[PDB]
Amino acid sequence: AYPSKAIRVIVPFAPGGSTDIIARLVTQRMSQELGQPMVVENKGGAGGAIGASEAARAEPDGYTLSIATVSTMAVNPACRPKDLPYDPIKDFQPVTNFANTANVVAVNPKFPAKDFKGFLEELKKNPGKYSYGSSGTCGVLHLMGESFKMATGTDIVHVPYKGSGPAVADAVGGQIELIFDNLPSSMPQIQAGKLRAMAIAWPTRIDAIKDVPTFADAGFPVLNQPVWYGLLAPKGTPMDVVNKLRDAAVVALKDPKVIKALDDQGSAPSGNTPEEFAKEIKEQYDWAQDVVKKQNIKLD
Ligand SMILES: N[C@@H](CCC(=O)O)C(=O)O
Fold it and tell me: Angle at CA 243, nearest 5°, toward 66 and 73?
């Protein structure tokens, strides 16, 4: 009876990004429930395409799973419409959305602005001179940066990384002045004062960082789109497996230490149904097609 051995969990991004952070937090606690190890494998590269394509080829037995991200479910498909080696919707069985997650635009603290208003002013006075990091060329944070540029009338230079892990460290080091990130990986640095957050993408301000406005507060509600992290199995994985995993996710997401960690990092638990997640996946997918194809926001 499932599970009788270790479950591989593929994270399609480098260590120390939000995918990796949330993946390890939630599967650690799921594992305790399932009575089998869940072993995280980081497979970063190409905005999540490398790792997602690999997860898509796995046998549908439930022992090779992967972390859904907006990069892998929505933006990569839209960025590489002819040659992406997986269909996000047809090649995966959704299990559950772990968490809804805030995005953030942050700066190195030497950046000469203290708020979003002066942030825009500074960028407008220097078109083409500042650069920003992302988690990859066909990922949600590259699309975030490009969306920002279009909506605010700014010109800032994209520098992709193998995930936000290495991006956060370059932004903290000053090798890039700006970073577009999912909040959890930037959260420790912001708390420590090593980055300054300009805006978050979230329905409201977040208690961890109460003084950072949302993009809607900043006067750019089109930019106020969060992301999410969830669990995927290959298409054809039995419902027995899906419901077992989802149940363990639901238990894990009620754990008060997991609730706190999610809260503190800039996320909120979901633990919704496979179908509710599939609907979220389709929403993001459709939105990325809209944004990239209509609206003329170029990724490559
Ligand atoms: N950009 C990824 C996460 C990046 C990372 O985990 O390093 C996303 O779609 O959520």
Answer: 30
